DNA sequence: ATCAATATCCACCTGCAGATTCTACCAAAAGTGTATTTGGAAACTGCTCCATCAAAAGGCATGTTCAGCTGAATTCAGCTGAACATGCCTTTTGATGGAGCAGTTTCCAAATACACTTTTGGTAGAATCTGCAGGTGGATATTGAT
DNA sequence: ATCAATATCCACCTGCAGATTCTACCAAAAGTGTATTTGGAAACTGCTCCATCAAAAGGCATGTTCAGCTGAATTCAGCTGAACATGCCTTTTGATGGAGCAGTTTCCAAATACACTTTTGGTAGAATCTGCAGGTGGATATTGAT
């Protein structure tokens, strides 16, 4: 079996625009957005926590490697959705 | 076979790219310039799959060779 | 006889080939030339026909966005038409030269 | 009931989760960084579909395809500068013609 | 004479000079002072290894100095002898730097 | 505690053009000194930007070299001889 | 006390095998400081991903050598590649 | 007991290859680590700074000097085609740049 | 631009087939509970090195004057590259065989991990050694003539 | 058109800041013993890639005509380089207060570990829907002639 971000891509396009689809080629593009991103910010946050002497990649880290990695306002309200998406999982 | 990559199909890379017009040394030119950049990419490519103990390239491999030489390609796995 | 004016049909053709995003060199003759210099590091190598197609949009990306850079080039020297010097300007700059 | 629900989410935060611990990333992985990394792909995600489902509404499409990621990534400064080195297959390019080559 | 060398003469001899030469072309208390000022607009009262000023002054001159030779090559292209901000703007643009 | 401003009229007209002289120009239009601080001061606050997100990260009031390198590394200008 | 690690005495000892006169100033030291941790992160960097792109756990000499054929650029790649060879085989021999 | 010796004498290299050992296995490139992929390493490592401290050393010799500075490494690292395409996106602080003079530019 | 004639561009349809969704099953993955261990935050502090201030000198920025020569603009033609007709052929499309290559599946010797103990190689700091910065001022080369 | 003026080259010399050597303590390799992990050998498939081959669709090669672009030539205003005086402000060397970097200690909130238990995403046929073929012909744009 081979994975992909496929259905929750889909699942975000339904939540962005719920009448438009999305062609076979057009989610193979975004399955290695998602792939690319994903491997940028996590080896950035790899980085971070060694230069610090960390065993652990925190939200910290992560938080850095986003304002490290995205430009301005993308940043920023990544920042917003990832402090938001944590404040809201831990209440739990 | 480098001269299959004729100058029609040159002209036509050259108009997306904006081009209105055209010298006749260019097509020679660009041939060269197309071969360079193939043989590294294929060379490296090559290289993943000698490391993995295939025959097949693989459209990873050819991915990751593009990565490597800070050319990320989109559609065919990463 | 009728017959359009120098540059006319260019500036169509660039209009019809920048609103499209079909692959511009022809299959066979671009897969002829990936297997002979592939064969050049180890003849009879298979190749997924996906591999050859990512390779193809590489390519294709990487030279128009080379002319763009050329054709930027051109008109820095009040000129119109690319020429070998344009390229190479261009490259140099790129860093791959 | 999973973590994704939990924290508002799409993206799959459990297989982030194993992705960082599988990746020779780090000896530990905290429990708010799955969460966190998923919130900001999924955001991420979210504003490029956003922009390309735009960008095949103004073409009159009911189906983003490529050219209409490329058309989005573009056309947008932020998006453009992070994907600075990406090729979109079958993204094409930009109309774009320099103005000194058109007629008059 | 009173004796006057030609124009170019002089600005020929100074490139033989400074393309032999290593030393830090900028001054060092007003650059120290500029890299200051910029990253105190982004988080008051910070402190500087001297060391860390140094090597951004290293990185910044070499980045310069490389743009300059890039900017040379476009003046060269368009028949001119002179730089210009068309050809430093042609050059960041081929770069990549804003396209 | 005095205040910094306009700093970057300390990269005069002489030493941009020892820069340009290394760099091998010949002969300079009056614009370039203008448009050569501007290139400069956003290159630079480009890597201070990083360096300071590494120096928050890290818990410290003192920008080090490292965090210096480490921003020169991220974005594709590595520097060697400042780590130590 | 602050124990800092550095390659400082194995450039040194090099030095020494490749021009027995002549000497280098601590500036010129930190260079080559820089360039053995450069080199060193690419390499290692680049056979991680060949370990993980396969899914093997390990490290060994293979990926070191094949990224060591994805790094260095033609007739460095094939010494390299000899040196390396050669010591690992040296090595074996106990 | 037996006699200690070191992995690096044992592969015949002047680089520390235990301590190249350590920082592969510290360094979360992956959960183990080949017996032979240190001495690897440590090997190709130490040639290449035997291939840039000869050119090197040959610049300072050229310049009438015994002490290698960072401008000599400059020098070879610029002047040899290899050595530049790998280091192509590196800056050597206080290395200077290559005498070069467009044609175009001297007296006609 | 006025205008008629000519050529290509393109909004507009309509079906059908090729993709994109329903139906449905199931291992691998995700979650939940419990038992543990532990990396890193807090607190506390020595002591490196950072910020700041000053003097004194003299390097180098600044501001001015002026004309050499460069960029800009213009004119013109030689010749190169665009457009086109024509007629040939390469590539597309697609179908057929079948080999051999990826690609899983266990079994297990061989390799790597890891704690504890012992044995140096490597670092810091002190002590010693010594290029060469940086001051000489002739020796030679280049420049730009009146 | 040798000659004056200027700059660079190159060799000299010696103290001292910087480099090299040495020395002793100790962190961390190395040895040793044992537990755990793994990746190859043998084996079993079944997608999947190449080697054929052919008909006709388009797309390319070639040769001619000429529009118009590139490059040479020429002119001239005025910008920018070269050379000067002045004196600011950088550099240097130095002394000093103290921020905070870093080195250590305790000890929990937050991590890993392991056993089960549900859930989900992948998968793949079958059943139901946008998008390309591709008709156009009808605008839209271009062109030579006034």
Same mark, same amino acid.
């Given at each position: 079996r081979k994975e992909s971000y496929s259905i929750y891509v889909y699942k975000v396009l339904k939540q962005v625009h719920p009448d438009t689809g999305i062609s076979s080629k057009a989610m193979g593009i975004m399955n290695s957005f998602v792939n690319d991103i994903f491997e940028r910010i996590a080896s950035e946050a790899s980085r971070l926590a060694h230069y610090n002497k960390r065993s652990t990649i925190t939200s910290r880290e992560v938080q850095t490697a986003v304002r490290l990695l995205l430009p301005g306002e993308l940043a920023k309200h990544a920042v917003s959705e990832g402090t938001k998406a944590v404040t809201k999982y831990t209440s739990s | 076979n480098i001269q299959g990559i004729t100058k029609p199909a040159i002209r036509r890379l050259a108009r997306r790219g904006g081009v209105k017009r055209i010298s006749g040394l260019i097509y020679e030119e660009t041939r060269g310039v197309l071969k360079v950049f193939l043989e590294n990419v294929i060379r490296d490519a090559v290289t993943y799959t000698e490391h993995a103990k295939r025959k097949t390239v693989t459209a990873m491999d050819v991915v990751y060779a593009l990565k490597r030489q800070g050319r990320t390609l989109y559609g065919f796995g990463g | 006889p009728h017959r359009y004016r120098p540059g006319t049909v260019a500036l169509r053709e660039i209009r019809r080939y920048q609103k499209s995003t079909e !692959? !511009?060199?022809?299959k066979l003759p671009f897969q002829r030339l990936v297997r002979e210099i592939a064969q050049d590091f180890k003849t009879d190598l298979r190749f997924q026909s996906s591999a050859v197609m990512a390779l193809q949009e590489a390519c294709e990306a990487y030279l128009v966005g080379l002319f763009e850079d050329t054709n930027l080039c051109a008109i820095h020297a009040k000129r119109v038409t690319i020429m070998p010097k344009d390229i190479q300007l261009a490259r140099r700059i790129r860093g791959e030269r | 009931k999973t973590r994704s629900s939990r924290a508002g989410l799409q993206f799959p935060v459990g297989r982030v989760h194993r992705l960082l611990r599988k990746?020779?990333?780090?000896?530990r992985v905290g429990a708010g960084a799955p969460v966190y990394l998923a919130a900001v792909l999924e955001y991420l995600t979210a504003e490029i579909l956003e922009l390309a489902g735009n960008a095949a509404r103004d073409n009159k499409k009911t189906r983003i395809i490529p050219r209409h990621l490329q058309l989005a990534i573009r056309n947008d400064e932020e998006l453009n500068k992070l994907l600075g080195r990406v090729t979109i297959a079958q993204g094409g390019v930009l109309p774009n013609i320099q103005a000194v080559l058109l007629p008059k």
């Amino acid at each position: 079996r081979k994975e992909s971000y496929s259905i929750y891509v889909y699942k975000v396009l339904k939540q962005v625009h719920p009448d438009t689809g999305i062609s076979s080629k057009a989610m193979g593009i975004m399955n290695s957005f998602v792939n690319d991103i994903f491997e940028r910010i996590a080896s950035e946050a790899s980085r971070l926590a060694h230069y610090n002497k960390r065993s652990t990649i925190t939200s910290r880290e992560v938080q850095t490697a986003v304002r490290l990695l995205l430009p301005g306002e993308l940043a920023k309200h990544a920042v917003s959705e990832g402090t938001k998406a944590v404040t809201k999982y831990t209440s739990s | 076979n480098i001269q299959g990559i004729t100058k029609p199909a040159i002209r036509r890379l050259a108009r997306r790219g904006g081009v209105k017009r055209i010298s006749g040394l260019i097509y020679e030119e660009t041939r060269g310039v197309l071969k360079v950049f193939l043989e590294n990419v294929i060379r490296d490519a090559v290289t993943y799959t000698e490391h993995a103990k295939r025959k097949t390239v693989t459209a990873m491999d050819v991915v990751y060779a593009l990565k490597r030489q800070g050319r990320t390609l989109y559609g065919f796995g990463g | 006889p009728h017959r359009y004016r120098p540059g006319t049909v260019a500036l169509r053709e660039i209009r019809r080939y920048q609103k499209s995003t079909e !692959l !511009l060199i022809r299959k066979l003759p671009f897969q002829r030339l990936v297997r002979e210099i592939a064969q050049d590091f180890k003849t009879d190598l298979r190749f997924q026909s996906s591999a050859v197609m990512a390779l193809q949009e590489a390519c294709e990306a990487y030279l128009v966005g080379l002319f763009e850079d050329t054709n930027l080039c051109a008109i820095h020297a009040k000129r119109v038409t690319i020429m070998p010097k344009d390229i190479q300007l261009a490259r140099r700059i790129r860093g791959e030269r | 009931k999973t973590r994704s629900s939990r924290a508002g989410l799409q993206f799959p935060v459990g297989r982030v989760h194993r992705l960082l611990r599988k990746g020779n990333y780090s000896e530990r992985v905290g429990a708010g960084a799955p969460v966190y990394l998923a919130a900001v792909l999924e955001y991420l995600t979210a504003e490029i579909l956003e922009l390309a489902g735009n960008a095949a509404r103004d073409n009159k499409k009911t189906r983003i395809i490529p050219r209409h990621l490329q058309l989005a990534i573009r056309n947008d400064e932020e998006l453009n500068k992070l994907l600075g080195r990406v090729t979109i297959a079958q993204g094409g390019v930009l109309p774009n013609i320099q103005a000194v080559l058109l007629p008059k």
